[PDB]
Amino acid sequence: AKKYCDVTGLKGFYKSPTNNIRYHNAEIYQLIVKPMAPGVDQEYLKLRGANFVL
Amino acid sequence: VTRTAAHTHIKGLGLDESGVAKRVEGGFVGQIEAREACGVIVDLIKAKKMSGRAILLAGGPSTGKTALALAISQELGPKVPFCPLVGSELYSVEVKKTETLMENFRRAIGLRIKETKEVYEGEVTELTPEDAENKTISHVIVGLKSAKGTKTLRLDPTIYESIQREKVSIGDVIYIEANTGAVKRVGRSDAYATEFDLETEEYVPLPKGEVHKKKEIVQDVTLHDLDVANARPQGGQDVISMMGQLLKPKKTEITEKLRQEVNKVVAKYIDQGVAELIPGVLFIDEVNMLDIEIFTYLNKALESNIAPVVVLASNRGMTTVRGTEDVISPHGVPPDLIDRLLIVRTLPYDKDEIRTIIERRATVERLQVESSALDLLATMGTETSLRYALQLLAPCGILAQTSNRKEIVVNDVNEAKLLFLDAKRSTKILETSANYL
Amino acid sequence: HPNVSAPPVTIEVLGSSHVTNSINNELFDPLISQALSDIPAITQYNMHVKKGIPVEDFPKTGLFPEPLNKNFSSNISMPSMDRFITESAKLRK
């Protein structure tokens, strides 16, 4: 399956090692993924169906 | 934009259909008799009948002999082979000089082979090798796939061994040519790019065309291409090796037996109508540097049945033949060889045709020159030499450019004349000074 | 012994794995690298007897030229402890 960016929908070349969120590029990472509040990364992964937290 | 060399302005002989010569056509001006002689010569070459013809062009330096050779070269067209050559190039340190002359002789004879190129492009969806022993695979069934569709092929053991050479797996874009059998692996497909996040497999996209593409080509080879193809001291010319062989092969004396066998095979292919024979022109510029031994071998080799039209050019007068001591001869050509030749004379020029030459080379190199500047350049060309004016067209344009102008005026011409010196003025400076200029 | 030992000049083409595969095939040709070497004896026994490969079907081996002694086998020279005595004349005496 093709991997996509979790917040922007583009080609997700990179995935963060902390919260397992696939992001597009550097601006996306430093503006969204790093300042992301806890408890919403599972909300992002629910759309991909990997809301691991149960 | 295109580069301009010395002979870019000349396109051809500029002759009419009736054989007469127009005064200003084809990049030529004047020289009507030698142009008509070379037109008769190119009609002889296009007749494709006779072998071993020779023509010597006689005339002073800067009279347009190599211009006539290039005009002959374009008049024959790209179909007819042409091997222009300096007379100094025959003296080689790997192989003897006569064998280099005979190599150039074979180089001036060419073939045409019509062949078709059918190819298969796309992704390996399936690869099922059927063994059918009789440990040895009988055949392999490979299915290819592109954007316009898919197509299944049946392949022999040798293409399967070439596939295993290229390390082709399922999902790799390949290249298969049906006639030759070349197998080239372009890379893994784009749909298989996310199996791993990072791997060495170069992911090329799927081809947008049909899998099967067929087109026809024409292969222009010469006889010498064939003789160096099947006479290798160390074989293996077919295998692609980016790093070379461990022993460098040396150029060797190719025997008459291989020439006879290549001639027999080429005649067999022509009699089937596969190949067409196009005789060409071997042009030897500055024949006066040829040794007497090359002249003797040329005397022998102008009698062969497959020899091309040989064009020689010289500018010397009563000169000693190279390699001799007391043999004076016209144009440095020994008198036995000059009986076989047809000498065409080349005349010098005067002021008006020098002016038309200079404005043609101004027009081709797209510098705008003023009229009185052109008259000064023509007068200076008549005084010094022609090629000095031809080589000082471009610094005049440079000095006009640095003064933010597009038209060359007289002051640029005097500035270039003061900066750059001809042979006579530099010789005058050379004679007066004592300490090595 | 030579002063500098150097591998052949590496050609680097950026963006193509076919160049890497072709260069890897050229430098490390399995027929030729198998030719200048030998097969281990356990592999020969496992090949001929266990898998039933005939002896003639083995790839050709042992074609590297034999060096003159064991001393000419490699360019590295081990520091001889016998030479340590003779390095210093005071120590040798």
Added chain:
Amino acid sequence: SLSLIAAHSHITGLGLDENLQPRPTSEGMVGQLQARRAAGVILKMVQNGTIAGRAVLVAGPPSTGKTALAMGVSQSLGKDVPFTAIAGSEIFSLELSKTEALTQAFRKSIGIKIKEETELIEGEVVEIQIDRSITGGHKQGKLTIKTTDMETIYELGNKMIDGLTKEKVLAGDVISIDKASGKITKLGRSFARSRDYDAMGADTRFVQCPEGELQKRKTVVHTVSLHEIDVINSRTQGFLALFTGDTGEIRSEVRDQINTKVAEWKEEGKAEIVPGVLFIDEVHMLDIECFSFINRALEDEFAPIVMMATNRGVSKTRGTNYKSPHGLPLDLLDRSIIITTKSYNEQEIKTILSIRAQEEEVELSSDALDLLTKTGVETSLRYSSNLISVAQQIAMKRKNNTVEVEDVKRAYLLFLDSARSVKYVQENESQYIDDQGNVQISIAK
């Protein structure tokens, strides 16, 4: 079919009678009756093949026909007799000495004849049934060979199984096998089996299925020169050196062994020695070492007849500083019989020009033939022969089939001979580059 019209293509042989008496004009050779009779005598002592190592020299002025008489001798000699026509410039080589070059020419001009007896079975293979031996020794096979006409089944030994496996042969592959010698070939793949496989192999060749009888019988005669045996026996894989030319100074023991076993082969009768003619054109272009080796190397029983041509008068010999007749030392002229040619009158020039016009398909009118005859007797024969073809092209450019006097006059005007070029450069010496490297390129001083 590859060969084109040359300067010497009209000559088909010496125009002799059965009594060695030359006809006035036969087989393209005109005149030179004494020279043609001498060449016929040389031809007869070649064809007898009982005399070894004679040197005959052909002497004459230029444009007389020494080369023409030599290649006429070659044409009357026929095929299956070796003939080597080399210039004196081919001797001087870098990796081979001059003496070894003459030895290679001498042994390239003499050969032996070998008879073959072939029983060939040329057919398309249908099936290769293998009868696998339990021990593996003496493997049996059932070959299904099949032409268009008939098919049968053959019995095969172990080594022919090895031969058909060491080169890969399958069903539908055209081969031929000899019964007596066991030679195996692979002609390719039959054209009926071309559409089975969608992409061809790298080496796969398409040949027609054979016709007629399966097993055919034929005898072949092979003529191998002694130099080819010298090349073959020198190296392990020496047949490439027959074609690349890298022989490399074959030692004397090899040639001595080859000579003695060709002699005992003649004794037991498998081979018959066929002598030949070596034609050293322009022999004045040779060193004194070459002349000395030619003198001492003609006294062996395996030495061909040497024909040499010279247009040089009393000039110096190369490699020395003294002048000698014909440019040859007196030792070489001692072991020589000289064929002397003489120049032609206007009738012989007219007939030779007419022959060369009929050879190049040029149709000459009578007045144009007379004008070309006058130009030939004035300047030279070869200038007129070269004028014929350009006169034809000038006539064809004027939309005419035959040549008139005007086309010959225009061809004479456009192209210059040697004498007019000499006068035209002697009149203006300032424009050309002198012997001292002085020239005037300025058109106005």
Added chain:
Amino acid sequence: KSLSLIAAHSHITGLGLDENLQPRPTSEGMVGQLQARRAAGVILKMVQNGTIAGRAVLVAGPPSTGKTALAMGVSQSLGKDVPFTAIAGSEIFSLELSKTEALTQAFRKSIGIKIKEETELIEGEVVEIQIDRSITGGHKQGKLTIKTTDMETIYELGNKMIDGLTKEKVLAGDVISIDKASGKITKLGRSFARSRFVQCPEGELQKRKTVVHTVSLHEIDVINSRTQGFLALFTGDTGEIRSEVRDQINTKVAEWKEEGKAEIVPGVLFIDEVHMLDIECFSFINRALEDEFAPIVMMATNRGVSKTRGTNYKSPHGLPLDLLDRSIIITTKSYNEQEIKTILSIRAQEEEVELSSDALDLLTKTGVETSLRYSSNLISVAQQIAMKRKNNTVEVEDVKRAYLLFLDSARSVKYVQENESQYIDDQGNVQISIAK
């Protein structure tokens, strides 16, 4: 920079010319020869235009007048990636290559082709690697965490990346560059961890990088000849590359230029002491400049009405009349006292010499009477004499000492001519005995 000690032409950084091609009196390390500098600037603009091919220019004059200095100014002011080939005249006489084909190699080494290509490259700082070995080793999977100053990511590795990471052992804290297409990893160096050192690279991995390649036509001729690998470019055993591979290359680069994938970069060939070439090499130079893919050839010579090599006669500049007809001649003049003084001051400035004004004037006078290279050799050796007496400044007595110790040309000629019996003459007669 490379390996660069002080050479004879090191102070030259180009041609001291304005935008109107007017030479400054002293600029860019080069002083004097105003007409020669303007002519060389015109030739420089002719090269930079690129629309003119196969022109031959000739710099001629007395020795020690700056013809080689002018050529080195042209070479320094060309720039980078425009090819410049400098050969002496005595180099084409080879024992394994013919002279005309060596000239063909020297011609074709100076024409370059310009290809632009883009590649993806991953260059980051590795946080940690983690690879789990299998039960036996049939399949190996592992994870890889790399970072930059901006980004941070985790990668899943297949078989081939793990095999290419075990080879070239990559630890935590390394900075490596990963080529995705060719599978090539290069270790740039260890990052700033105290425990070679290179700073951590900036963000935006998988970045587009454009590398512009300039390859001479001689390399393509050696590559396209299938019997020669690229190792003939370094070992130098090409062995008379044939004409058909060259004409194939000429047509292919022509179709590349018309297709738009490449751009022809013409260059300069400089031949030192062109008078040592022979007559057939001159003939090949005459008929080789006609070609469209030919450089602009600079020849420097000082001989005047000398014999030509391989012929018996004599010709001006040691060159036959047709080659002088094919060429345009730049004449260099000699130097007066002030130009010699400024050259010596520039040379002393580059060789790090602090020298007295009177010692400078003495070296200037020795450079007026005796040729300039004698004084230029004398500065450094006088400076060594100056440090020999522990003085950091070169004085007049150091210059007098260097004059007394190291002889010039004319004094050695006189000293030989007065004592000719001690040496060996043309006939090999020598009187070694000192008395009777």
